[PDB]
Short mmCIF file of C-alpha atoms and ligand atoms in Angstrom, two decimals:
data_model
loop_
_atom_site.label_atom_id
_atom_site.label_comp_id
_atom_site.label_asym_id
_atom_site.label_seq_id
_atom_site.Cartn_x
_atom_site.Cartn_y
_atom_site.Cartn_z
CA UNK I 1 168.75 64.00 43.68
CA UNK I 2 170.13 60.63 44.86
CA UNK I 3 167.23 60.81 47.32
CA UNK I 4 164.53 59.85 44.79
CA UNK I 5 166.69 58.38 42.04
CA UNK I 6 168.00 55.50 44.20
CA UNK I 7 164.41 54.28 44.37
CA UNK I 8 165.81 52.12 41.56
CA UNK I 9 166.88 49.83 44.37
CA UNK I 10 164.65 46.74 43.97
CA UNK I 11 163.20 48.60 41.02
CA UNK I 12 165.73 46.55 39.06
CA UNK I 13 166.88 43.41 40.92
CA UNK I 14 165.14 39.99 41.20
CA UNK I 15 158.18 43.55 47.95
CA UNK I 16 155.49 46.30 48.05
CA UNK I 17 155.57 45.97 51.86
CA UNK I 18 158.67 48.12 51.58
CA UNK I 19 157.01 50.86 49.49
CA UNK I 20 154.76 51.55 52.50
CA UNK I 21 157.31 51.07 55.26
CA UNK I 22 159.49 53.79 53.75
CA UNK I 23 156.39 55.99 53.50
CA UNK I 24 155.67 55.78 57.24
CA UNK I 25 159.39 55.42 58.08
CA UNK I 26 159.95 58.93 56.76
CA UNK I 27 157.05 60.33 58.76
CA UNK I 28 158.65 58.91 61.92
CA UNK I 29 161.90 60.85 61.45
CA UNK I 30 160.39 63.97 59.93
CA UNK I 31 162.63 67.01 60.47
CA UNK I 32 165.00 65.27 62.96
CA UNK I 33 168.13 65.11 60.76
CA UNK I 34 169.15 61.51 61.39
CA UNK I 35 169.92 59.81 58.07
CA UNK I 36 166.92 59.34 55.78
CA UNK I 37 169.25 57.64 53.30
CA UNK I 38 170.39 54.47 55.12
CA UNK I 39 167.05 53.84 56.82
CA UNK I 40 165.80 53.37 53.25
CA UNK I 41 168.01 50.51 52.17
CA UNK I 42 167.29 49.19 55.65
CA UNK I 43 163.58 48.79 55.08
CA UNK I 44 164.13 47.93 51.40
CA UNK I 45 165.92 44.62 52.04
CA UNK I 46 165.08 43.32 55.53
CA UNK I 47 163.12 40.56 53.74
CA UNK I 48 165.58 39.52 51.01
CA UNK I 49 167.04 37.12 53.60
CA UNK I 50 163.91 35.42 55.04
CA UNK I 51 164.96 32.63 65.33
CA UNK I 52 168.02 32.72 63.07
CA UNK I 53 167.30 34.88 60.01
CA UNK I 54 167.72 38.54 60.87
CA UNK I 55 171.41 38.34 61.77
CA UNK I 56 171.85 36.90 58.28
CA UNK I 57 169.57 39.54 56.77
CA UNK I 58 172.56 41.87 57.15
CA UNK I 59 175.26 39.29 56.47
CA UNK I 60 173.38 38.92 53.19
CA UNK I 61 172.26 42.47 52.40
CA UNK I 62 175.86 43.67 52.91
CA UNK I 63 177.34 41.44 50.20
CA UNK I 64 174.43 42.14 47.82
CA UNK I 65 174.79 45.86 48.60
CA UNK I 66 178.17 45.61 46.84
CA UNK I 67 176.38 45.71 43.47
CA UNK I 68 174.21 48.81 43.01
CA UNK I 69 175.20 50.45 46.34
CA UNK I 70 178.63 50.57 44.68
CA UNK I 71 178.16 54.26 43.91
CA UNK I 72 177.65 55.47 47.50
CA UNK I 73 178.57 53.19 50.42
CA UNK I 74 180.84 55.23 52.75
CA UNK I 75 180.25 54.84 56.50
CA UNK I 76 176.60 54.50 55.46
CA UNK I 77 176.73 50.72 54.99
CA UNK I 78 177.48 49.59 58.52
CA UNK I 79 174.24 51.28 59.59
CA UNK I 80 172.37 49.46 56.83
CA UNK I 81 173.60 46.33 58.61
CA UNK I 82 172.13 47.06 62.04
CA UNK I 83 168.78 48.29 60.80
CA UNK I 84 168.36 45.34 58.46
CA UNK I 85 169.20 43.13 61.42
CA UNK I 86 167.20 44.87 64.12
CA UNK I 87 163.64 44.92 62.88
CA UNK I 88 162.25 41.46 63.64
CA UNK I 89 162.05 40.46 67.30
CA UNK I 90 162.89 36.91 66.21
CA UNK I 91 166.62 37.63 66.69
CA UNK I 92 166.14 40.06 69.61
CA UNK I 93 168.77 42.26 67.91
CA UNK I 94 168.33 45.44 69.99
CA UNK I 95 168.52 48.54 67.74
CA UNK I 96 171.13 51.11 68.84
CA UNK I 97 171.21 53.51 65.93
CA UNK I 98 168.45 56.12 65.91
CA UNK I 99 168.14 55.12 62.24
CA UNK I 100 167.82 51.38 63.04
CA UNK I 101 165.02 52.41 65.37
CA UNK I 102 162.83 54.15 62.81
CA UNK I 103 162.69 50.91 60.78
CA UNK I 104 162.03 48.57 63.69
CA UNK I 105 159.00 50.80 64.06
CA UNK I 106 157.83 51.37 60.53
CA UNK I 107 158.05 47.62 59.77
CA UNK I 108 156.56 46.69 63.17
CA UNK I 109 153.61 48.98 62.49
CA UNK I 110 152.85 46.71 59.55
CA UNK I 111 151.76 44.17 62.21
CA UNK I 112 148.98 46.37 63.55
CA UNK I 113 146.04 48.05 61.86
CA UNK I 114 143.88 46.97 58.95
CA UNK I 115 146.83 45.29 57.08
CA UNK I 116 147.85 43.85 60.43
CA UNK I 117 144.42 42.29 61.03
CA UNK I 118 144.65 40.80 57.57
CA UNK I 119 148.16 39.30 58.06
CA UNK I 120 147.22 37.49 61.32
CA UNK I 121 144.48 35.53 59.56
CA UNK I 122 146.05 35.20 56.12
CA UNK I 123 149.22 33.64 57.62
CA UNK I 124 147.06 31.71 60.09
CA UNK I 125 145.34 30.43 56.92
CA UNK I 126 148.25 28.62 55.29
CA UNK I 127 149.55 27.39 58.64
CA UNK I 128 145.92 26.35 59.10
CA UNK I 129 145.68 27.11 62.83
CA UNK I 130 142.02 28.08 63.12
CA UNK I 131 140.78 30.87 65.40
CA UNK I 132 137.23 29.80 66.42
CA UNK I 133 135.42 29.77 69.81
CA UNK I 134 138.16 27.42 70.83
CA UNK I 135 139.72 30.80 71.84
CA UNK I 136 136.90 32.74 73.52
CA UNK I 137 136.54 30.52 76.60
CA UNK I 138 140.32 31.17 77.12
CA UNK I 139 139.21 33.56 79.86
CA UNK I 140 139.53 30.43 82.05
CA UNK I 141 141.75 28.21 79.88
CA UNK I 142 145.25 28.84 78.48
CA UNK I 143 146.58 30.40 75.19
CA UNK I 144 148.21 27.91 72.80
CA UNK I 145 148.82 30.72 70.27
CA UNK I 146 149.67 29.82 66.67
CA UNK I 147 144.07 29.71 67.50
CA UNK I 148 145.05 32.93 65.65
CA UNK I 149 142.78 35.23 67.68
CA UNK I 150 145.19 34.35 70.51
CA UNK I 151 148.24 35.62 68.59
CA UNK I 152 146.41 38.85 69.30
CA UNK I 153 147.05 39.32 72.97
CA UNK I 154 150.42 37.59 72.87
CA UNK I 155 152.49 39.61 70.41
CA UNK I 156 150.30 42.16 68.67
CA UNK I 157 148.64 43.72 71.66
CA UNK I 158 152.02 43.89 73.33
CA UNK I 159 153.85 45.47 70.39
CA UNK I 160 152.92 49.11 70.98
CA UNK I 161 154.21 49.22 74.58
CA UNK I 162 157.67 47.93 73.50
CA UNK I 163 157.70 50.44 70.60
CA UNK I 164 161.00 52.36 70.71
CA UNK I 165 160.22 55.41 68.61
CA UNK I 166 158.83 58.61 70.11
CA UNK I 167 155.81 59.00 67.77
CA UNK I 168 155.91 55.45 66.46
CA UNK I 169 154.50 54.26 69.82
CA UNK I 170 151.47 56.53 69.94
CA UNK I 171 150.95 55.46 66.34
CA UNK I 172 151.29 51.75 67.11
CA UNK I 173 148.84 52.60 69.88
CA UNK I 174 145.94 53.70 67.69
CA UNK I 175 146.40 50.87 65.19
CA UNK I 176 146.66 48.49 68.12
CA UNK I 177 143.29 49.81 69.32
CA UNK I 178 141.76 49.10 65.90
CA UNK I 179 142.55 45.44 66.58
CA UNK I 180 140.73 45.43 69.95
CA UNK I 181 137.55 46.97 68.45
CA UNK I 182 137.75 44.00 66.00
CA UNK I 183 137.97 41.75 69.02
CA UNK I 184 134.96 43.71 70.42
CA UNK I 185 132.77 42.93 67.37
CA UNK I 186 134.17 39.37 67.28
CA UNK I 187 133.05 38.75 70.82
CA UNK I 188 129.50 39.95 70.26
CA UNK I 189 129.00 38.14 66.96
CA UNK I 190 130.52 35.11 68.69
CA UNK I 191 127.90 35.47 71.39
CA UNK I 192 125.07 35.63 68.91
CA UNK I 193 124.78 39.41 69.15
CA UNK I 194 125.07 40.20 65.40
CA UNK I 195 124.93 43.91 66.19
CA UNK I 196 126.92 45.86 68.77
CA UNK I 197 130.34 45.07 70.18
CA UNK I 198 131.26 43.52 73.54
CA UNK I 199 131.90 46.73 75.49
CA UNK I 200 133.76 44.61 78.03
CA UNK I 201 136.62 43.52 75.76
CA UNK I 202 137.31 47.14 74.85
CA UNK I 203 137.45 47.65 78.59
CA UNK I 204 140.20 45.06 79.09
CA UNK I 205 142.31 44.85 75.90
CA UNK I 206 143.04 48.55 75.22
CA UNK I 207 144.06 51.50 77.37
CA UNK I 208 141.12 53.91 77.67
CA UNK I 209 141.81 57.47 76.65
CA UNK I 210 142.26 56.44 73.04
CA UNK I 211 138.57 57.28 72.64
CA UNK I 212 136.52 58.69 77.59
CA UNK I 213 135.89 60.52 80.87
CA UNK I 214 138.14 61.63 83.80
CA UNK I 215 137.30 60.97 87.49
CA UNK G 1 111.25 18.50 75.78
CA UNK G 2 112.47 17.28 72.36
CA UNK G 3 113.46 20.88 71.65
CA UNK G 4 116.66 20.97 73.75
CA UNK G 5 117.29 17.24 74.13
CA UNK G 6 117.84 16.65 70.38
CA UNK G 7 120.87 18.92 70.69
CA UNK G 8 122.47 15.47 70.93
CA UNK G 9 122.53 15.65 67.15
CA UNK G 10 126.26 15.97 66.29
CA UNK G 11 126.79 15.83 70.04
CA UNK G 12 127.33 12.13 69.36
CA UNK G 13 128.27 11.39 65.73
CA UNK G 14 131.70 11.65 64.01
CA UNK G 15 131.22 21.96 63.61
CA UNK G 16 130.88 24.87 66.09
CA UNK G 17 129.82 27.04 63.11
CA UNK G 18 126.45 25.37 63.61
CA UNK G 19 126.20 26.20 67.33
CA UNK G 20 126.11 29.89 66.33
CA UNK G 21 123.98 29.58 63.22
CA UNK G 22 121.19 28.01 65.25
CA UNK G 23 121.60 30.83 67.78
CA UNK G 24 120.97 33.55 65.20
CA UNK G 25 118.67 31.29 63.15
CA UNK G 26 116.24 31.26 66.06
CA UNK G 27 116.36 35.03 66.42
CA UNK G 28 115.36 35.34 62.76
CA UNK G 29 112.12 33.37 63.21
CA UNK G 30 111.31 34.57 66.71
CA UNK G 31 107.57 34.32 67.44
CA UNK G 32 106.55 33.56 63.81
CA UNK G 33 105.46 29.92 64.28
CA UNK G 34 107.21 28.36 61.28
CA UNK G 35 109.04 25.21 62.38
CA UNK G 36 111.98 25.80 64.74
CA UNK G 37 112.55 22.05 64.72
CA UNK G 38 113.54 21.28 61.10
CA UNK G 39 115.48 24.50 60.57
CA UNK G 40 117.75 23.04 63.28
CA UNK G 41 118.80 19.84 61.58
CA UNK G 42 119.05 22.04 58.51
CA UNK G 43 121.81 24.21 59.89
CA UNK G 44 123.29 21.27 61.84
CA UNK G 45 124.36 19.28 58.76
CA UNK G 46 124.67 21.57 55.73
CA UNK G 47 128.44 20.96 55.98
CA UNK G 48 128.55 17.17 56.50
CA UNK G 49 128.52 16.90 52.69
CA UNK G 50 131.21 19.45 51.65
CA UNK G 51 129.19 24.05 42.19
CA UNK G 52 127.99 20.51 42.87
CA UNK G 53 127.88 19.88 46.62
CA UNK G 54 124.72 21.34 48.10
CA UNK G 55 122.29 19.18 46.12
CA UNK G 56 124.19 16.24 47.61
CA UNK G 57 124.21 17.83 51.06
CA UNK G 58 120.56 16.71 51.23
CA UNK G 59 120.98 13.50 49.25
CA UNK G 60 123.47 12.71 52.01
CA UNK G 61 121.87 14.23 55.11
CA UNK G 62 118.63 12.37 54.30
CA UNK G 63 120.21 8.90 54.41
CA UNK G 64 122.27 9.77 57.50
CA UNK G 65 119.12 11.23 59.09
CA UNK G 66 117.80 7.66 59.11
CA UNK G 67 119.94 6.91 62.18
CA UNK G 68 119.20 9.23 65.11
CA UNK G 69 116.32 11.11 63.39
CA UNK G 70 114.67 7.67 63.53
CA UNK G 71 112.56 8.79 66.50
CA UNK G 72 110.84 11.76 64.82
CA UNK G 73 110.96 12.11 61.02
CA UNK G 74 107.33 12.59 59.84
CA UNK G 75 106.74 15.18 57.10
CA UNK G 76 109.58 17.04 58.83
CA UNK G 77 112.36 15.38 56.82
CA UNK G 78 111.56 16.62 53.33
CA UNK G 79 111.99 20.18 54.66
CA UNK G 80 115.35 19.22 56.15
CA UNK G 81 116.25 18.37 52.56
CA UNK G 82 115.51 21.76 51.01
CA UNK G 83 117.09 23.83 53.76
CA UNK G 84 120.24 21.70 53.78
CA UNK G 85 120.33 22.16 50.02
CA UNK G 86 119.44 25.82 49.80
CA UNK G 87 122.00 27.63 51.88
CA UNK G 88 125.09 27.93 49.68
CA UNK G 89 124.73 29.97 46.50
CA UNK G 90 127.11 27.51 44.84
CA UNK G 91 124.14 25.37 43.72
CA UNK G 92 121.75 28.32 43.25
CA UNK G 93 119.11 26.14 44.96
CA UNK G 94 116.41 28.80 45.54
CA UNK G 95 114.81 28.33 48.99
CA UNK G 96 111.00 28.00 48.91
CA UNK G 97 110.18 26.97 52.45
CA UNK G 98 110.03 29.81 54.97
CA UNK G 99 112.13 27.46 57.11
CA UNK G 100 114.73 26.92 54.34
CA UNK G 101 114.96 30.68 54.21
CA UNK G 102 115.91 31.27 57.84
CA UNK G 103 118.99 29.06 57.37
CA UNK G 104 120.11 30.52 54.06
CA UNK G 105 120.25 33.66 56.16
CA UNK G 106 121.72 32.54 59.43
CA UNK G 107 124.51 30.65 57.61
CA UNK G 108 124.99 33.48 55.08
CA UNK G 109 125.39 35.95 57.94
CA UNK G 110 128.46 33.93 58.92
CA UNK G 111 130.09 35.49 55.81
CA UNK G 112 129.78 39.03 57.10
CA UNK G 113 130.93 40.68 60.31
CA UNK G 114 133.99 40.08 62.45
CA UNK G 115 133.98 36.25 61.80
CA UNK G 116 133.29 37.09 58.18
CA UNK G 117 136.33 39.39 57.92
CA UNK G 118 138.38 36.61 59.43
CA UNK G 119 137.15 33.88 57.01
CA UNK G 120 137.95 35.94 53.85
CA UNK G 121 141.62 36.17 54.82
CA UNK G 122 142.01 32.83 56.59
CA UNK G 123 140.69 30.95 53.52
CA UNK G 124 142.59 33.36 51.27
CA UNK G 125 145.60 32.22 53.34
CA UNK G 126 145.64 28.54 52.45
CA UNK G 127 144.63 29.23 48.85
CA UNK G 128 147.46 31.77 49.09
CA UNK G 129 145.84 34.48 46.95
CA UNK G 130 147.31 37.60 48.53
CA UNK G 131 145.33 40.82 48.99
CA UNK G 132 147.95 43.63 48.77
CA UNK G 133 147.97 46.98 46.89
CA UNK G 134 147.64 44.86 43.83
CA UNK G 135 143.93 45.49 44.65
CA UNK G 136 143.72 49.19 45.55
CA UNK G 137 144.52 50.58 42.09
CA UNK G 138 141.56 48.41 40.87
CA UNK G 139 139.63 51.69 40.72
CA UNK G 140 140.96 51.75 37.14
CA UNK G 141 141.90 48.08 36.62
CA UNK G 142 139.75 44.93 36.85
CA UNK G 143 138.89 42.49 39.75
CA UNK G 144 140.46 39.03 39.42
CA UNK G 145 138.89 37.99 42.75
CA UNK G 146 140.19 34.88 44.52
CA UNK G 147 143.44 39.35 45.69
CA UNK G 148 141.14 38.61 48.67
CA UNK G 149 140.23 42.25 49.35
CA UNK G 150 138.45 41.95 45.99
CA UNK G 151 136.29 39.02 47.14
CA UNK G 152 134.86 41.85 49.20
CA UNK G 153 132.93 43.81 46.64
CA UNK G 154 132.12 40.74 44.55
CA UNK G 155 130.21 38.44 46.88
CA UNK G 156 130.30 39.81 50.41
CA UNK G 157 129.23 43.34 49.74
CA UNK G 158 126.48 42.00 47.53
CA UNK G 159 125.18 39.43 50.02
CA UNK G 160 122.95 41.67 52.13
CA UNK G 161 120.90 42.99 49.17
CA UNK G 162 120.04 39.42 48.03
CA UNK G 163 119.18 38.46 51.64
CA UNK G 164 115.74 36.81 51.65
CA UNK G 165 114.71 37.11 55.29
CA UNK G 166 112.78 40.10 56.61
CA UNK G 167 115.12 40.97 59.53
CA UNK G 168 118.05 38.90 58.27
CA UNK G 169 118.67 41.56 55.59
CA UNK G 170 118.86 44.57 57.89
CA UNK G 171 121.13 42.39 60.00
CA UNK G 172 123.33 41.37 57.06
CA UNK G 173 123.32 45.10 56.38
CA UNK G 174 125.04 46.20 59.59
CA UNK G 175 127.61 43.40 59.51
CA UNK G 176 128.19 44.21 55.85
CA UNK G 177 128.92 47.80 56.91
CA UNK G 178 131.49 46.56 59.45
CA UNK G 179 133.41 45.18 56.46
CA UNK G 180 133.43 48.54 54.62
CA UNK G 181 134.78 50.43 57.69
CA UNK G 182 137.58 47.78 57.58
CA UNK G 183 138.06 48.71 53.96
CA UNK G 184 138.07 52.38 55.13
CA UNK G 185 140.98 51.82 57.56
CA UNK G 186 142.70 49.57 55.00
CA UNK G 187 142.67 52.33 52.44
CA UNK G 188 144.18 54.93 54.75
CA UNK G 189 146.86 52.65 56.17
CA UNK G 190 147.53 51.60 52.57
CA UNK G 191 147.99 55.26 51.71
CA UNK G 192 150.45 55.83 54.51
CA UNK G 193 147.84 57.45 56.74
CA UNK G 194 148.31 55.21 59.83
CA UNK G 195 145.49 57.05 61.58
CA UNK G 196 142.02 57.85 60.25
CA UNK G 197 140.02 56.00 57.64
CA UNK G 198 139.46 56.88 53.98
CA UNK G 199 136.13 58.69 54.32
CA UNK G 200 135.68 58.20 50.58
CA UNK G 201 135.44 54.40 50.61
CA UNK G 202 132.71 54.56 53.25
CA UNK G 203 131.04 56.91 50.82
CA UNK G 204 131.03 54.38 47.98
CA UNK G 205 130.92 50.84 49.46
CA UNK G 206 128.05 51.16 51.97
CA UNK G 207 124.60 52.73 51.89
CA UNK G 208 124.59 55.83 54.10
CA UNK G 209 121.95 55.91 56.79
CA UNK G 210 123.59 53.04 58.61
CA UNK G 211 125.39 55.72 60.63
CA UNK G 212 124.04 60.69 58.60
CA UNK G 213 122.04 63.76 57.57
CA UNK G 214 118.92 64.38 55.40
CA UNK G 215 118.60 66.98 52.58
NI1 LIG S 1 158.51 42.60 57.22
NI1 LIG S 2 147.26 60.50 68.33
NI1 LIG S 3 139.77 64.08 77.89
NI1 LIG S 4 128.53 27.03 56.15
NI1 LIG S 5 119.21 47.99 62.75
NI1 LIG S 6 117.94 60.33 60.51
#
């Protein structure tokens, strides 16, 4: 009963990004018997501590844990310090625990898909980096990245291949394909097509099979 | 001869948004014999003058026109003052000229589609308005709009129906459907689906037929 009750984690602290991560984080380790108890606090705090910021995410979440996590720490508190330290590839903190892996996947899946396509441009909005045609002709020029549409084939399109969770990869594979199709429509529209999608960008930015013949 | 040469409009002034608008603005009035000469300057300056801003876009573009447009003004200069004044529904300047209509469509199509889906979130980025789940449960709550994802069914999803150009509407209809499908994937992902799309949002935010049976 301390499986649903402890939801009163940030549900009494002081954000929704976590609500979802847990949701898909559970689906990743469904019926594997790993530790769906630590992984939780892992994905529930990885942000409470803002390339130096993840190593402190645990040197921060550990001290703060000694407040409400007072009831049940045990050995399950050193694992909540690797997960919440190995999720953002800003610190390159390689995840070793099979629990610290499920999070580095659930949170990293928040970079792809519909929400992912929204983050790239929202962020790119404040930072004001643009994303216009200044990026299409990059078939012959070079990627300056954060031109948001470039951030696409620099991090995002390369995220699924470096996915370290069995299912999480095939999942970060579909969502990563949703981004390409967006690129497909963006190319056309960008080439005054207004209708179809550039069936040439789908051919280069996403592994066929995810939609296909066999020779 | 003075149809391609005059491209040296902003090509020597002091932005790419125009390059495209003309492209699709020509396709809208293809073989109709209207005035593919004024419509051009129309879509080439509607921005040089930043709900009061469109009426001045012409009270500004007219004076500036008296510089390079010195060679060929004629009656074709009073039309370049209605178009470049009737394109943004911020001034509600109803377009009367069939030329001032092709622009209010070509420029308004830049709100839908792939580029459209990027603008909503980019802009929403600087203004920092968010767009998270705080918008999904709005099936029972109310839309505060600029929550970017709301800006969707408030302006964008209503743009194609108020389109005033023969073809331009069926065109702003497809691109407007591309936005819904995005909403479709956003719903699923938002509901921890990670795979398909909420085939319930496609059912409510876009007129079937654009993809369908017949009873
Ligand atoms: Ni995160
Ligand atoms: Ni699959
Ligand atoms: Ni097959
Ligand atoms: Ni504009
Ligand atoms: Ni059609
Ligand atoms: Ni039919």
